[PDB]
Every structure is written in structure tokens, then in C-alpha cells.
């Protein structure tokens, strides 16, 4: 088990799986000025807090918590962007899922994940802010949407801000990302009818000082 030494990628970029960045590690090292952060424009919530938390971790393990194959009623591989290319073609963050309507329908999602592991889990998700009613319809069908997220300590409801915006890295849309630490035997619960960038992979983390000798 070796340290994870990020070359061209930020902490946020690696966690989310920025495709422009070329299973188990100890601590993480991030360079001073990584070229690749968030390829798609937007915000990473409480980023300073996450970086400090992650600097205190010396065991990481990436686990699949919501398999991409489990989205039977939503497209899970159709959402890509020229902001996030791979080998010259539009791509997307690899560790979260851009869910898109399927057959002109976006059923309301209810998904829970229960932390059956012995370690704390870092889980990330996001929201896509669309540019106008037409784009909203095209991608998600439903005009008025939300993402609700709950744990034993988190109670969040995200609502897209649908508005015309300047193009940043070619995109008028924005994506904001959020995270939490899910304690053992706690569960995270999602309900959404659109604009949801869903977790696929999460990270088991152990703080320095918490391991057996
Ligand atoms: C798509 O939705 C329509 C409307 O309900 C339905 O009639 C049709 O069978 C659906 N097609 C597929 C392939 O699910
Ligand atoms: C997680 O699963 C365990 C085992 O089934 C259960 O006892 C516990 O209530 C679940 N946690 C939550 C928050 O539902």
C-alpha cells in the first residue's frame, strides 16, 4: 500500500474522476498548482474543510456503492461535455453519474446506501444547474426539480437555479458538488426528479491516530 501522489489533478478532480487526469492507498499528496481541477464549471462545497480532513487520513479505499448498472430507468452514460474531454471526445467525471431522462421520462429516484463497513465513508454528489426551460426539458423532462439528501446528521435539499449564464470552458451550465462522511451503520438517502449527479464510488477513510498498532 503506497501513498497517492497526484500529478496533474486536484483533490476534487481526483475524487470526482476528472477524465483529463491520467483501489487502495495510504495518504494523499496534492501538488501546488494542479492543471486539472473541476473540468466542468461550478463549485465544490466546503472544499477547504475537505482538504484539511483528507490531509489527516492515512488509509483510503475506493469502493463501488451504487453501481452504474443499477440505474434501470435513467440513462447513465449519455451525459458528457466538451468541458471534460477524453481522447478528444466529450466525456465526464468518472466516479459520479450524470443521470439523464430515458424515453422522455425521468422517474423520481429513491436510493439509499447503508454503510455496512467498519470505516467512515466519504461520499460525493452534485447538482447540474441548467440554462433554460428547454435544456431542462431536454435533459430531465421535469421542469421543477430537486435533490434531497439525508443521513443521521445531514438534511439537504438542492434546487437548480435555471438561468442564462456566461460560457465557462464552453458551458453555460454549472455543476456544484457536495460531500459528507457517512458513519458505519448509518445510511444516506437520495430522492430526486432531475439534475442529479449521483455517486457511484465512495471512499473508506481512516484518520491518522485511529488504526490498530
Ligand atoms: C416509451 O414510452 C412510451 C410512452 O409510455 C411507451 O409507449 C413505450 O413503450 C416506451 N418505449 C420503451 C422502449 O420503453
Ligand atoms: C443499516 O443497516 C443495518 C443492518 O440492516 C440496520 O440495522 C440499520 O438500521 C441501517 N441504518 C439505517 C440508518 O437505516
Numbering used by the authors: 47 to 68, 74 to 264
Wording from the paper:
We first expressed F55–271 and determined its crystal structure at a resolution of 1.5 Å. The F55–271 fragment showed the same three-dimensional fold as that of the A/Anhui/1/05 HA ectodomain 41 with an overall root mean square deviation of 0.92 Å for the 213 Cα pairs.
The HA1 subunit is primarily responsible for binding the virus to cellular receptor sialic acid, while the HA2 subunit mediates subsequent fusion between the viral envelope and the host cellular endosomal membrane.
